[PDB]
């Protein structure tokens, strides 16, 4: 029981799918649980995929950096898709130490305790159109460490102010 | 010939050294080559460690995101340590597509083609004092993929404007 890792790139290099298509595919194929940790989440296509997973019965847990959470909120309002009236999705924020706002600079997508996407790709249009990035697709034993990290971050997260 | 990965955290969790102490240690123990890919590099302690490696005879290659390269330049000026009169260090910039500046959102430290630190820790004071982050220490076969990525990024890099 070891670990397997493949690298994907943006723009793509020697693989067939873009990182975004891979994210959308990983979400489409979720059966049970999506755990997501993200610094900025404004990408509407990835959001729609997540909402769709939630309607299928997949439990979705999202931890967002506090300082950027408004951008996600704005986007869900645009999409006419309040995350509070979506039963299967739960969202909390994570912050670092203030001095200047400290941030959660972590991101990864952890699906069905089976597969992780970890890297520098944030869920924003600029990462499709403008930025160079890279991710790892991880399976095997190291996925349990991402599971543990997700739980550790959740334990230090807060209910976003917005939410009543 | 497989791959080994350990995780480090900031703030630290179940390991003795901080990520920064680990970065400084990895640089101290470099024998031959440092290859560094960084989005923002303003941390003076890590810089001093790199300069010191260079004086020992270690070849140092640094690829920085173009849009933030001025912050690195500013810092080297403050430190009275021009990277152009340092024989063993070479620095080029990498950019993404413009629309709004596209960025190289990649970072990793690759020492002696043996060990990689990959994760969300940027070489700035805020990552010591303020932000939550995580890295992987990688050895074994996957290190060759970081070597290849470093070379691919170098091939798409430019001489920084500043430099004559
Ligand atoms: F492992 C866990 C799985 C679910 C919860 C409960 N929960 C509620 N909202 C959440 C947001 C992000 C993450 C978790 C969340 C706790 C731990
Ligand atoms: F799959 C794609 C392949 C190429 C592009 C457009 N493009 C070309 N070079 C790029 C560098 C960074 C970011 C985007 C880039 C978008 C999607
Ligand atoms: F693998 C390579 C190792 C060194 C060079 C030559 N070079 C000169 N400046 C550099 C900056 C960053 C990286 C490389 C650099 C090319 C390829
Ligand atoms: F090794 C260290 C251990 C703790 C601190 C100070 N601190 C405490 N909690 C933090 C969260 C995010 C960032 C810094 C933090 C600095 C260095």
Swiss-Prot record, chains A, B:
* Variant or mutagenesis effect after changing residue 107 to A: Loss of interaction with EGFR. Loss of activation of EGFR
Where in or outside the cell it occurs: the entry states: Cytoplasm; Membrane
Describe the processing and modification events after translation. Answer: Phosphorylated in vitro by CSNK1A1.
Record text about domains: All members of the FAM83 family of proteins share a conserved N-terminal DUF1669 (domain of unknown function 1669) domain of about 300 amino acids. This domain mediates the interaction with casein kinase 1 (CK1) isoforms. Therefore, it has been proposed to rename DUF1669 the polypeptide anchor of CK1 domain.
**Assembly notes:** Interacts with EGFR; positively regulates EGFR inducing its autophosphorylation in absence of stimulation by EGF. Interacts with RAF1; displaces 14-3-3 proteins from RAF1 and activates RAF1 within the RAS/MAPK signaling cascade. Interacts with AKT1, PIK3CA and PIK3R1; activates the PI3K/AKT signaling cascade. Directly interacts (via DUF1669) with casein kinase isoforms CSNK1A1, CSNK1A1L, CSNK1D and CSNK1E.
Family according to the record: Belongs to the FAM83 family.
Function field = Probable proto-oncogene that functions in the epidermal growth factor receptor/EGFR signaling pathway. Activates both the EGFR itself and downstream RAS/MAPK and PI3K/AKT/TOR signaling cascades.
Stated name of the protein: Protein FAM83B
Which species is this record about?
Homo sapiens
């Amino acid at each position: 029981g070891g670990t397997h890792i493949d690298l994907l790139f943006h723009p793509p290099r020697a693989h067939l799918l873009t990182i975004k298509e891979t994210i959308r595919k990983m979400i489409k194929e979720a059966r049970k649980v999506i755990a997501l940790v993200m610094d900025i989440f404004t990408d509407v296509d990835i959001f729609k995929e997540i909402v769709e997973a939630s309607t299928r019965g997949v439990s979705v847990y999202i931890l967002l950096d506090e300082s950027n959470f408004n951008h996600f909120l704005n986007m869900t309002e645009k999409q006419g898709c309040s995350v509070q009236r979506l039963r299967n999705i739960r969202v909390r924020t994570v912050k670092g130490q203030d001095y200047f706002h400290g941030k959660m600079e972590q991101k990864f997508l952890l699906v069905d305790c089976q597969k992780v996407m970890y890297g520098s790709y944030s869920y924003m249009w600029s990462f499709e159109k403008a930025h160079l990035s890279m991710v790892q697709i991880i399976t095997g034993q190291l996925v349990e460490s991402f599971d543990e990290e997700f739980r550790t971050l959740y334990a230090r997260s807060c209910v976003p102010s917005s939410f009543a």
